[model samples]
Structure formats: structure tokens, C-alpha cells
Target: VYLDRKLLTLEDKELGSGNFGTVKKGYYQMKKVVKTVAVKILKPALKDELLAEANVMQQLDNPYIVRMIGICEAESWMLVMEMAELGPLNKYLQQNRHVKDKNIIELVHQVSMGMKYLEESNFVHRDLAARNVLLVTQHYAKISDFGLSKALRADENYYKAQKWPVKWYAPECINYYKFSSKSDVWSFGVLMWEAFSYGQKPYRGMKGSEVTAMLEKGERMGCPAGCPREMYDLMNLCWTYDVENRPGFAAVELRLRNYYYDVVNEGHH
Candidate 1:
């Protein structure tokens, strides 16, 4: 492998552009020895935002989390990261509609394992939506995008402005902005819904404000068509309006493991 600092830009193709920055598919050094990587070029105006992301990425080290290979701040601030051909989980699920239950369970296990790792490290992936979770391969799931991550400090308020994404936000996350491992549990519940629904869109016609209103009123996104009853119940538990009532990541992981084991031993009922 070539040294990261010795890299020279070869080509930069746009991957996707968002409010924060634009992602580009690029190769560094020469094609002969350079490997493909995704470069996130931060918007010049959002220096502090980019710095926050860089800080989080530097401190986070988990197999399920995307690895930051290099950084370029001499001209523009750019974050070089591993490339994932499988794309985002939402897109992958759309392409492979009608996925098997066993496959879905396996993907859920991989996702839960990733979340469990983050929780143990005292990092909260405030954005745990399907689009942020990318697959390196069929069996490998890696969580990406640290722009929205926050360290679970005792003085931090979970319901702060930086954490807004109402569609996937748990009740407590919206009501009190107070989040914990249980807040992640709520997002994982949404992920389960995504797995079962495959290509279905979230909150369909509902606006962010509307979703928050419903969540505050003890309503949650309902399971998509054909979602298994058992899994639906699990999703419900994670989405309880009262944050204190939500299960922790550890509890979620254990329950999922048991669900998988039971499915394997007795086959899906």
C-alpha cells in the first residue's frame, strides 16, 4: 500500500451532494498502486462542521464503522474513506426486493452488532437511518457518516438542534432531546422496519413536524406490509414514547440474537 500522504489526485467523480458536503469517487496516487476511495470535500463555509466530523472520525475505531484512510486540509478539507460498492442499505434492499427472512435476520444481526459496538464506546450515532448504513458485501455492514455523531457526555442535551431528523427520531429524541443508548434502540427499530419493508419509503407523506407530533402523541411509524408479527412487537418496544421505557442496545442485541436462534432451530413460523 502506498503512503497516505504521498497520494496525488487522479480523478474525482461526484458520488452524492448533501447540505453538509459533497462525496466524490476518487483514486489517489497512480492507478497502478492506488486504490479507490470516497472523498468527502467539505463545503468551505462549513469549516466547523467538517472539523467536528473529523474529530469524531479520529476518535471512533470500530470494525462496523467506516475507516478514515487520510485527510487533505492543505487546500480544501477532504476526508478519504473506504469505498463500498454495495451502496447504502436502502438502495441495496430496493434492488434486491423480496429478500428472504434468513437474509434479513442476518443483516439485522450485523447492524445490531455495529450499534452495540458504538454504544459500548460511548458514541451515539445520532443518524442511524438505512441510508447511512452501507454494505461492503452481502455479509458485511458498515455504518458511515459521522457528521451527526455525538459523544454521550453527561452534560449534553440529546434534544439539541444538531440531532434533528424527525422521521427517524425517537419520541424522547423529539420531546426532550434527551437521548441515550435507548435512543439508538429506537432508531434500530426503524431499521428493522426498513429491512422488512425493503423499498418502501419512510413516513411516506408525513412531514417532519407531523411525525414529531404523532410520536409525541404515542404513535409511531407502523410496520410495512408483510412484516413479521414478532419483529413488529420488537419495533414497537423500541419506539415507546417514553424514553425510559425503551430498551438499551444490550437488551436489543440479546433479544435479536434469541430471535435469530429460535428462527434457525425451529425455522420461521
Candidate 2:
């Protein structure tokens, strides 16, 4: 549904701001109900990208993925999306400083669930990181930001990177300029590291070139403090240089569920 500018009211509260655009908390009013939402106002040059994002988001109906309420084009192109009150997962982890391991596992599990759905849909999320995951509540996390996502053709298994995030990319993505579910799996491992590390930046203080060189040497980040050995082992698998050997999101989701269950039961025993 096309939204009317007159029916929406934006507040001074800025949720996010970047070179791409700004996001703010807003209210969307209908005849009988008013709802709180997050509005992303993209630069006019990115209107088409936003439209493509909306199209991809509209087709997805998973609880672990942020829902797109609608878009307003009557004025500046504004995307009205479900408000994740706690905001980006990385910032939340940074602010809290001591999120429980079980909670972190649950959040990562939720993201894997979402990614599994995206994989089944043949959609490649070119960007998958902690910053792109939003926390609706302590226990609820949703995958956000579809700006770089692409739906592959029936015969196509990879897409050209052109230019993208380096620290989170897989070896194949760096060497061949190709992105696939395998590459997304690599990013998901980095996301797990961020969550477990209380939001520390991947390859902190290093240049992108250096990170790529380190990866080429078969080096990977060490396990985060307090991160389960099992989970760290999973991350190692996700970082496999042989893309074909990387586990699919479905398998990853199952492992997360097992880890989550073990964590939950550990408190009792």
C-alpha cells in the first residue's frame, strides 16, 4: 500500500544515519489506528534501491526478518518498517556489556532461522553482519537491511561482488569476486563472533587489505572470551576455504538449536 505523507508523523529521534540515508522513529496513522514505526529516508538517488529492497522484503514472511510496513513516495522516499525498539544488535550488546551466553545463542539462532528462509528463497544477502541485525527485545532478533540482497536466477549460483564488506567476506568472495549462500555463511560466522565478543569490530584496527591477507594465510579470529567451544568450532566450519564444505543455513540452524538447548539445560544441572 502506498502511504500518504499527511498520514505519517516523524519525530526528532534519529534511529540511524549513514551515507546511504537516515532512519527515524515515526508514527503512521490510519482512520482508526495509529502505529509506531521506523522510517528510512533514502537519498533520492537510492530510491530505486529502496524499491528493490521493499520488493524483496515484501516476499518474505518470516518472524525472524524485519517486516516492512510500507513505503511512502508522495514526498521523499520513506520506508516505514517495524520498529525494533532496542535498535541494532551490535549497539545493544555494546551498551549492555554482559548479555548472557544463552541469550546471545538465541539471537544468533534466530538470525540463522531467517537466513535459512532466505537461502530457501534463492536470495543472497550480500550483507550479513551484527549491524544489520536488529533487536526487537532481549530474546527477539530480526535480520534487517536488504539493500545489497539479490535473488539469483535458476541457473546462477553466484553474483559479482563489485565492491563490498571485506572483513566478513569469505575466501571465494575475495579471490573470485563471487557471492553465494556460502559467502553469506562466512558473514554469519563473523556475526556470531561479534555477538559473542560483546560487539567488538571484526579485525579491529586492521585495514581491509590486511584482513584479506590474513585470511589467505588460513588465519581466523580466535574464540571470543566465554564463547562456547562448540560454537567456535561451528564458526571454523563456516570459514572453510572450500566453499562447498561450508554448512548450509539449514544445518547451521539445527546446530544453533542444539547449542541453545544445551545452554538452557546447563542452568538446571
Candidate 3:
């Protein structure tokens, strides 16, 4: 759906900017209500690129995933998306230095739930990372930034990829440019590492080749300090070297659900 440009008003403050262009906090006026939205204004030359992201987002309707409000064609092609008030997961973790294991597990559970939905829908969220996940509330995490997401084709599951964040990538992604839900699983492991480490960069001070060499040796990053052993074990499941062996998002979500309940249940007096 398209929104009338005249009905949208953007605040001067920009939310963030990327290769897609600037995202601004905006207000959309409808018949009886006003909605707060994020407007992604794209480079004038990237109408098609923005539309691809819009199309993928429009098909996704889950509480854990960001929703596309509508499209607007002003000076540049723009996408109206849901506003996640707390911004990215990593930033939120960094901001709240006192985040506990329960809080971390809850956030992990939410993202796993979102990824489970995407995996079931046959979509590969190529950019599966904490920075791409947005937080609506401290407890509500929604997967956002679908610019690199793709719906698997009927005949093929993996996509021939592009410039990707190396440390977040799986072996196949780096070597063969193959990206699938399995590769997404690997990124999800890195995302968990990022969250548990309080937004620390993966493979800090290591080069991509060095990281790749380590993976080639069948080694994975050790558990983050203070991260529960079981949680890191789940991350190890995600990082299983054989792509087919890596647990799917559904399995990951179920595991996290069990962990979350176990955690909260223990908090009782």
C-alpha cells in the first residue's frame, strides 16, 4: 500500500543512515488516528532495491518481525516501517550495563522466535545479527532491516551472496557465496555471542581469514563470560560445521523457550 506524501510528516532528527539512505522518525496521519513510523528514504537511484526490501517485509506478519506500514514516493522512494522505540538489540544491551542472565535469555528467546517464523516461511534473513534486531520494549524484540533478506526460490534454497560482514558469516558464505537458513543459523550463533558479550564484536582483533582458518579447524568461539553453559551449548548447535547438522530456528526457539521458563521459574521465592 502507498501513503499520500502530504499525510506524512517527518521530524528533523534522523534515526539512522545506511547504504539504503536515511531513516527518519515520522508521523503518519490516517482517517482517525496518527501512527508513529520509521521512514527509510533511499538513494534516488535505488528505487528497485528499496522495493525489494518492502516486498519481503510486506509478506511477513509476526509480532517478532518488523511490519511495513506503507510505501511513499516523495523526492526518493521511501518505505514506512514500524518504529522499534528502543532501537537495536546490541545498542540496548550496551546502554543497560546491568542486564542480567534472565534478561539476556529473554532477548535471545524473542529473536529465536522471530527467526523461527522466518525459517518456516522459507525466508533467509541473510543479515541475522543483533544490530539488525530491534527492540520495541526491553522484553519485545523484533527482527528488522530486511534489506538483505530473501524468500527462497522454488528450486533453490541458497542465494549467491554479496559483500557481507565476515565475522558474522558461515564458511559456505565466505567460500562459495552460498546463503541459506543454515548459514543464517551460523549468523544467529554470532548474534547470541554478541548479546551475551554485551555487544562485543565477534572475533575482536582477528582477520576474516584468521577466523575462517579457525572454523576450518573445526573450532568455534568459546562461551562468553558469564553466559550460562547451556546457552553457549545452544550457540554451538547453531555453529555446527555441517550446515545440515545445525539446528533450525524452530529447534533453537524451542530450546530457548525451555531455558527461559526454567530461568523465570527459579526466580520464585
Candidate 4:
């Protein structure tokens, strides 16, 4: 991804509204090459939050990490990023109903390796899920939307104000405000369920409180109709009640690797 580092301005008509402000489909004039990029023009109210998100993304340099083009302060505050060909993972899964287990494993593998790097880098993606990951091609999913972790967690339900996806959360994080790499691992397990479920909501039709109650009763989501047992076992480990029992992303990647190439290969036609 050779990115044009030069700064750009956006006086173009609004493409559409975003969480922060408006997003327009335009980029700085690179003179020589015209590889289009997406520019997000933020409103004054969202200035600080957007800056914080950019700060977390600034130092990241990995295939799975979202690539930050740079920041702007000219006409208004702006965040620039590589334009994704595919919008979101869950939406892609919703559209591709014929996705084979092998292909789904590939997506999970990319995300697992990415999470491994994030944990190793002393970072915790409190918002890890299929919706937070952006796809470049069928093979690449760069983790995005790493902010919003500052929201305090509580017992029974994790998030405070929003309709948080507590289904992806660890019990401890839900019971207390405690968060760490291990918590992210727990979230990754839910993401695995999401991948296998083809983006279906976990604990379908259950509210956050209901999901928590069931989990407290030792209930867990079952394997997707035809998910590999190997993958199902790995997902189960991530849900281990004790925080210390969950496997780190590094080991998770190893097991996923074994399943994709060896276990699933032999089991499939």
C-alpha cells in the first residue's frame, strides 16, 4: 500500500454523514497518481475523540492494522485512511451466504494474527468484532475502530450508555471494569462465533442482560451448524470463566493455523 503522504483538503460536497461528521469521497491532489482515498471531516464536537482514535492508529504498522494516511488541520479536522473495497466483515458475510468453512477460517486467521500483534504491541482493542474489521480484499481484514474503549464496564452488562455488544465480552469485564489483553482475547472468541455464524447476532434475540444471565448459568453459544470441532474447541477455550484460563492471541493463531491447513484440510473433500 504505497500511500501519498502529502496533505489534502476537502471542500467537496458531502458524501454522507458519519459518526464524527461528514465523509466525502476525495483525497489530496497527488499530481502524478490519482489513487482515491476517503477523507472524514469531523465536527467540533467530535474533534477530541477523533484525534484520540487517530493517535492510536498513528504508530501502528502491520498488514492487519488499518493504515492511517495522516491528519489534517486546514479547513477542518480530518482523518484520512486507505479506501476499503469491502465495507465491513459482517455485511460481507451477510451477502456471501455460500462462504465455505475454509474461506471463513482464512478471515478468522487474518484477524487472529492481527490480534496477536495488537496484544504483543501492548494494545487492547476493547471493540474487537466483525464490525470493527475492514476488508481490503477477500484475503485481508485490517482491524479498525479501536477507540471507544474508555467506556466504563460494569457487572451484568459491560457498556453503560450504548447498546453495547456484550455478547462478545468476557464475564470479568462485564462484572467489573477490568480490561486487558486477556479481555480482548475473550472478545476475539465472540468474533470467532460471529465469523462462524455468518454475522448472525450471538445469543439471537437475547438482550445483553439475558446473555449475561445465561453465561452466568454456564451456558454458551453452540457451534455453528457445520463448524469444525477444532475451531469450536478453540472458541470454547476463549470463554473459559476465569480470565487467566483464556489463551492468548498468539497461541490462538497457532491452533487456527493447524486447523486451516491440517485438520480442516484432511476433514474436507
Q: Which candidate wins on lDDT? A: 2
Model 2 spans with C-alpha error above 4 angstroms: none
TM-scores of the candidates in the order shown: 0.87, 0.96, 0.96, 0.84
Q: Residues 1-269, candidate 2, lDDT per residue (tens digit)?
A: 57888889999868788666799999888679998899888764487889998998888889999999889975578888888999999999999987898899999999999999999999999889999999989999999999988888899988875557888888888889898998899999999999999999999999999998888899999999999999999999888889888898999999999888988899889
User: How do the residues 1-269 of candidate 4 rate in per-residue lDDT, one tens digit apiece?
Assistant: 22344545454677456567776766656557755566677764478877877887886778988877777775677778766667678888989878888888988899988888877666667888888777888777878875564423332222332235587878887788567777888888889898889888778888889988998899889999888887899889988888777788889999888788875567665
Which pairs clash (backbone N, Cα, C closer than 3 Å) in model 2?
Answer: none
| Candidate 3 TM-score over all chains jointly | 0.96
Error of 3 at 21 (Å): 1.6
Deviation in Å, model 3, residue 159 alpha carbon: 2.4
Task: List residue ranges in candidate 3 displaced over 4 A.
Answer: none
lDDT of 3 at 33: 93
Model 3: per-residue Cα lDDT over 1-269, one tens digit each:
89999999989998788887798998898788998899898763477778888899999989899999999888888899878988988988888978898998998898888888888899988888889988898888899888888889988878886556889998888889899988988999999999999988898899989999999998888888899999999999888988777878888999999999998999983
Candidate 1: minimum summed lDDT over ten consecutive residues — where?
Answer: 1-10
- What ranking emerges by TM-score with the best candidate at the front? 2, 3, 1, 4
lDDT of 2 at 96: 100
Q: How far is candidate 4 from the true structure (C-alpha RMSD, Å)?
A: 5.0
Q: Which ten residues in a row have the lowest lDDT in candidate 2?
A: 40-49
Scored against the true structure, residue 164 in model 4 reaches a CA lDDT of 53
Give the lDDT of residue 238 in candidate 4: 86
